[PDB]
Each structure stands twice: as C-alpha cells, then as structure tokens.
From Swiss-Prot, chain A:
It is a peripheral membrane protein. This is RNA-directed RNA polymerase nsP4. RNA dependent RNA polymerase. Replicates genomic and antigenomic RNA by recognizing replications specific signals. The early replication complex formed by the polyprotein P123 and nsP4 synthesizes minus-strand RNAs. The late replication complex composed of fully processed nsP1-nsP4 is responsible for the production of genomic and subgenomic plus-strand RNAs. The core catalytic domain of nsP4 also possesses terminal adenylyltransferase (TATase) activity that is probably involved in maintenance and repair of the poly(A) tail, an element required for replication of the viral genome. Ubiquitinated; targets the protein for rapid degradation via the ubiquitin system. Nsp4 is present in extremely low quantities due to low frequency of translation through the amber stop-codon and the degradation by the ubiquitin pathway. The chain holds residues 2007 to 2505 of 2513 of the full protein.
From Swiss-Prot, chain B:
The chain holds residues 2007 to 2504 of 2513 of the full protein. This is RNA-directed RNA polymerase nsP4. Interacts with mRNA-capping enzyme nsP1. Interacts with protease nsP2. interacts with itself. Interacts with host TMEM45B; this interaction leads to viral replication inhibition. Ubiquitinated; targets the protein for rapid degradation via the ubiquitin system. Nsp4 is present in extremely low quantities due to low frequency of translation through the amber stop-codon and the degradation by the ubiquitin pathway. It comes from the Viruses. It is a peripheral membrane protein. Residues 224-339 form the RdRp catalytic domain. RNA dependent RNA polymerase. Replicates genomic and antigenomic RNA by recognizing replications specific signals. The early replication complex formed by the polyprotein P123 and nsP4 synthesizes minus-strand RNAs. The late replication complex composed of fully processed nsP1-nsP4 is responsible for the production of genomic and subgenomic plus-strand RNAs. The core catalytic domain of nsP4 also possesses terminal adenylyltransferase (TATase) activity that is probably involved in maintenance and repair of the poly(A) tail, an element required for replication of the viral genome. It is found in: Host cytoplasmic vesicle membrane.
Amino acid sequence: PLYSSSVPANYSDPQFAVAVCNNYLHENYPTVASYQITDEYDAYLDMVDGTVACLDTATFCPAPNIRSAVPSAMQNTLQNVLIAATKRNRELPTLDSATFNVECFRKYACNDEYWEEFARKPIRITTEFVTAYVARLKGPKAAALFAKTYNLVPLQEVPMDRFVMDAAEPLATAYLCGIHRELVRRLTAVLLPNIHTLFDMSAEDFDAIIAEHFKQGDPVLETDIASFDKSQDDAMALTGLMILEDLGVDQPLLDLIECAFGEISSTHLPTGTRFKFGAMMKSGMFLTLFVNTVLNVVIASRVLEERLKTSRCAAFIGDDNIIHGVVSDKEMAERCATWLNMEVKIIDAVIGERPPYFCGGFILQDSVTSTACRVADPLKRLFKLGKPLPADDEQDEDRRRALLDETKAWFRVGITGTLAVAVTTRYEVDNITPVLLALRTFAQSKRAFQAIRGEI
Amino acid sequence: PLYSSSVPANYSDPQFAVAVCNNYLHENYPTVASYQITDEYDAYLDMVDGTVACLDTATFCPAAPNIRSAVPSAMQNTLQNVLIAATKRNMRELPTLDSATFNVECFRKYACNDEYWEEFARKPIRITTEFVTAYVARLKGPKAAALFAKTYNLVPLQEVPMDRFVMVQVIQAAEPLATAYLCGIHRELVRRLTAVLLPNIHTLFDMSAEDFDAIIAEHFKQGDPVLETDIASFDKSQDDAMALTGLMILEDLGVDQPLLDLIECAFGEISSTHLPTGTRFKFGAMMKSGMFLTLFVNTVLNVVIASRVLEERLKTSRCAAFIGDDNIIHGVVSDKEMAERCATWLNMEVKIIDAVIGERPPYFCGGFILQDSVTSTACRVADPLKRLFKLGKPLPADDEQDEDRRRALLDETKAWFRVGITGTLAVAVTTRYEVDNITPVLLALRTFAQSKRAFQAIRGE
Ligand SMILES: [Mg+2]
Ligand SMILES: [Mg+2]
Ligand SMILES: [Mg+2]
Ligand SMILES: [Mg+2]
C-alpha cells in the first residue's frame, strides 16, 4: 500500500498523442498487432455469413452462396508469417519441422510440375491488372486517369518503387489484390486434382462435386483444427512462409506486403464509430484466409499421408475440410497425437448415418434423388438471428434474402426429414422442424422479418 | 446437381414464429445454449474492464480505483455444462466420475481446510426474507423493500419458500424475487468458498486495487519466483470431468437438488428471451446473475487445476491468488514431474509459466506484478499495451460512458507515472512483448486522459 509519488506528463496537443500511438504500432508491427484487426475480420465475416460467402461475393477483389452461421474467430496468421520472415532474415528444430511439413504437403497434396516456374518467376502485378482493377471499380475513364496519374507503362510490371510506403494506396491496394488472385491461381495449379479449395465457388458448383463423389454409406473424414492456434505456432508460421515463397512470394514481395500491412497498424486512431471495412482490410483478411487454407492442407497431408493423395475428393477452405473415403486408424491417430497433441482431432463421419459437417452445414443425402449435398445448419442460423442489431433496412433485406435461400433448401421434400435427423444426431436436441417453419415465416416478407428485431 | 423440389413452409403469425423459436431454445436448454448469451457476457465485461472490476463494481449484487483489465473477454457457458452434468447424473461414464472425484480430492487436500464440509452438507444454501428485502432496499429504498416484502407475503426471519417465485418454471409476477434470491446464492457461495479455502489462497470476488496491492506488497519480494498456470486454451467449459467437478464442489458448498432446480429453471427462461432481439444487449440483473455464477465456477476450477498440478506446492505457497481463469502462485518453480502431471492430465492445454519478480514479470488480470524501484514494494500495474489496443475499438457516441472511460484511463496513467514504476514498467513491457520502449505511449494516453476535449481525439470526428 506504499506507492511512490505519481507525476504524469503529456503532450501539448491530442493530435501528437494520436500520431505517437499510431506510429508506435506501425514501428512495432509485426512483432505485435492490435486485436482490433482480427475483431474487424470477425465482424466483416459474421456480417457476410462466413468465409466462402465472403470470397464468393468479394466486391473489391473477386476471384446462392455457401453461407455459415458459425461465428468467426480469426487470428493474425499473416502477422506471424511476417514474424517468421524477420527471424529468417538457433531454432533449427523449427526449421526441420517446417521443412518436413512442406515435404508432406508436396508429397501427398501436390504435383511437382510448377515449382521450378514459380521459383524463377516471382509474383509481379502488371499495369493491365491494376488498370482493370480500377476500371471495374469506377469505369474505363477513371482507370485511364488512374494509369496516367501513376505513370503506368502499358504491358509492364508495376514498378515496386512507384508506391512503396516504408498517397498511392489505391495502387498498393490494387497490387495486393493481384497478389491474392495469383496466389489462388498458383495454388490451384500445384494441388492434385482431387484436392479442392473454395476460394471462389458457389453452393451449386460445390454441390456438383459433392453429388458426384459422396454416396450413401461413404465414410468422410474431418480434421478439426479449431483448437489449434496455428497462427501463433512458430513451425506453422515458418511452414506458411515457406510455401508462400515456393509459390513466388519472394523477398521484394514480402517487403511490400509487410510495408502495406504495417500501414494498417498505423490506422489505429481515431477510431470512428464503426469498423470502416477498408479494401486494404479485405486484402489482409484474404491473405490470412489463404495461408490458413494452405496450413489446413498441410495438416491433412502430414496426418493422412497417402490417404489424402488417394482420396477421391477432398475439400478445404479456411480451417474446415472434408476428406472422402478415409477412416481414422491408430497409426493416423498417433501421428496426429504426437505431432499436435490434442490441438487437432480426427472425426469419422458417414453419409446418411453420422453426417459430415462442413462450413456450418451438413452433408446430407436427398431422400428423393439419392444425391448428396450441403445444407446449412438451422440451429446455428437460429442462434445467429438472436444478435441484437441496429436498424439497417438494406442490410435487413440482405439477411432476409439469405434466410429465404436457406429455407428453400431446408424445405426440399427430400431434405426436411433427414436434416431434422442430422440436427438431433449432432446436438441431441428435439425435432428442429418447428424452427424450420418459424424461420421460413420470417423470411417470406419484410414485415415478418421485422419480428426478429421487434419494436423500436 | 439434382435437388428435390422445394415446397417451402411457414406459419401465418410472425409472433407465433417468435414463440416457437423461444420455446424451442427453452425446451432444449441446457443441452444447447445460444452463443448470444456468452457474447453478451463478453460485451458487458469488456465494457466494465474485466472480471475483477465487474465484481468489484457490481451494481445489483455486490458485497477507490478498481483492478481493470484491457484483455478481451472470451467467456464460455460453464454454468450450462454444469447443468448438463447434473442431468447426466440424475456407468459407461465412470472414468468421468473417477476423474472429477480425484479433482475434488486434490482441491480438498491442497487448497482447503477440512472444517466446514459437514456443516455445508447438512445446511444447504437458502436465502431468507431479510436478505431479499435488504437487496431491494439497497436498490430502490426501504419503502420499496417493504412494498416488495408485502407483495410476496415474505415472513420475517424465514427462508423465502421457492414456491413463491417458481411453480419448475419462474412465476413471471415474481421475477424480482427470483433475481434477489440468486444474488443471495452468489453471496453465500462466495462466503462459503472463502470459509473452506486455506488462508494463503486468495480470491478476488470483492477486492479493490489497493487491497490486493497490500497482499502483493506483503508477500512478493525482488527475485521471488512466481508460477502461473495458463488455462486460457483449456476449454474447461465443454469438458465432461471439469463440469462434473464444478457440480460436485457446488454441491459440497450447499447447492442441493432444489437449488439446482431453481438455477436451471431460472436460466432456462433466459434462453426463452432470444427473440425479439432489440438493437443492443439489454444486460440486466438476471444476465449478471448467470455470469457471476459462471465466473464463480471458473474460479473454482482454476483452483482445482492448480491443486492437482502443484499438489503440496500450492498448499505451502505463501500467497496464491485466483479469479476467473487467472492465477499467480508465489514461491513455486516448475519441474519435470509437475510438467508431466500437467501434460498427462490436460495434454498441453494448460501451460505452466515461470516468472520472477524484477526480471521476467509475473502477469495477472491484464497487469504486471512489479517492484517499485523507490519503495522496493511490489504491486500490480495495468498493462499499457493492452490498454492501447483496447482504445482502438470504434464506439458510438456516449457522453456518460466516455467520461467513465476517461476517468478509468486517468487512474491507470497515475500508476504508470509513479516515479518508481515508469522505468520497470517500460522494461516489463519490452521483456514480455519484445517491443520498443512504451514510454511515448504512456505520455500519449495521459494526454487523452487529462480532459474531455483531449479524450475526444480517440474517437475523432
Ligand atoms: Mg522453398
Ligand atoms: Mg470440420
Ligand atoms: Mg460431494
Ligand atoms: Mg495467467
């Protein structure tokens, strides 16, 4: 209870205090990063109904939705990848673990045809892309103004010294969007054709893949990595950096990525009254989702080994996956246990009995067509609809149309019964069908949907 | 692919659909519970700067600067899962009973005296007329308390019969009575836990910053080792043996079956208030009651985990402090046997951290345990990096809350600028996070705190 005398000091202007706080966070990124960044990720993903729907309806950097009512819990994977990059430019135990991880990823998930190309051809964004990026935002005229203003020479890579920031942020935002598009394209090239990602895939196109490969009685395996804080794991971060490098993210690109994203850290104050959801925000969130998907595949590669390679159909996006035709064994369980302790668990599901789960939905067999499909989880949706929300007529209509789309799937005459069975099987709850009927009531009109929020 | 034809299907009255959703969640509690409940817990706790500040400044159910934390709350529904364990209780799950019974043995042997269990077993918790009247008198004055007592036919010097507010469903005309009753349960649970815990084991259910600093000062010296068990990654709320451990210790403290029935009945009704949502969380007394009970069980399981991992080293520690998921244990250093006990039991979901006063600062409730370089006396100082992170939250205008937040920041900056604190705090922040000298941030936050006009620069516009 003996405190020394307190003598506070301060700056002569609050704007000095703002700049000092922003500058401090800028200078100390990536070592630390504000949790407001991932809170903003969660808020955006929750508002657009999750990862796949966010990627599929991307307004700034594109390429019925797959919608999930599961709350987002994003961690700053990209921050820790950049921490690994700084540490690389002793812990050879980490290096040997990450190297083995990359070996498993290549051996069991990838072809080997493209690594030489990507090594000699790092990712570089061109004038034509960033112009077409601005053209789709504001029209052909504003893009030619954009190319003239930055002195962009046609058919040339955008010079990196044209816009580095270690205010031309429109150019930097356009460049980062080109990086994400090329990363998705290059990852799609290396992955074996039975291994699918969902960076831009509608519910109908994914359902075509499910319908083709998933039959009644088929086992489906899931690796649950929700409890594994891979974003704060040293070997995972180095694995992510290593595979990004293999895909063409060289040191100039890494420097550009760290420079651009240190600038987000500097937009801490003033806060405003709501998350601004910038286009730069979305680029960082997209890159985080990309690395998470890769690490998801890496974990499945190391745990399943050849059983992943020979799977007839395996799908990955964010932290979620399903792997057809694989049943856990004890060699598999020991590998997963000795490597990641109980941070990652293996789930054995079966089409028609113990339903597989994927992106907040059930993999169900339609009882009329005998065709498998993904159906959104109605219990999660009901939970999500309880969120108190300020009045917003345009967003209310968006949410109502999303509910309408979901209820149309629930009331397919081959789905309603097996969906209620799956919900009771997964959660041990009573028959969900009265809630299905209630939610469809809300969905059919703007007036009925208003009952969810209530008066005032 | 191929979809069967969709024949969508609805009700006519939207109010009927509301009732169906509410009744469904009511009927299927505790089996499932909406995450809106724990999102509301987090929102309330973040608003009032965390667990200790929330209990220390409890508006409805309480017993100077507060122990405030800028660490975001991530609450789980521990009380839900205790009630599931109660349902499961009323042989294939024998290992669960074996594990939870061993947990309670460890809790009793290494954290408790043995004096009170017989009394609590024959005297279950029952709340009396005098408490609920005094509860209402504190809230609305002695006139309203007498009105309250007369309305419910409360007989003085007598326990409140549970048939006055629960028929098992809560009489809605007697909801104020039920909330007053649950506040009495929390106060008695805190009293009885304090009775059984060894005197060197402290909880912070009602402790000011000054009072806790007095305990830190007496016991924590320069160079003293301080152990922490990190259970933040341990999802003890959906662990079967943890939930059953919490149930049995509640029972050992006097929560018998009628009391459990009341608790499940009252909080199942909360599940039936899912819709309509309104525009913001309403908070309110029944929400706070369930949150306090969750914090209580979490604190107990926190002590349980330390008991089983540390064994006699918890018992002989000169000072161990617990609240929520956080703890510090004076004078203990991890060893191989301890790490193996922890890993074998909870498989690297609980981490043991070795701290040292003055070199690697112990961390507790979003603050550092530091030795004042001038008084040579140890104390807790709030983490300035966490506070900086928290101030970045975009917030709608609220003149009253803005002044509350500015005044709390003023108190925090006062500790940071004690002439014996600033230096070792900068070193501690750099040691913990590997960041540059935090002192410019200390000055910037003090700038915001000095006036309402300066504080407006955080939100801007
Ligand atoms: Mg390489
Ligand atoms: Mg999964
Ligand atoms: Mg007992
Ligand atoms: Mg701790």
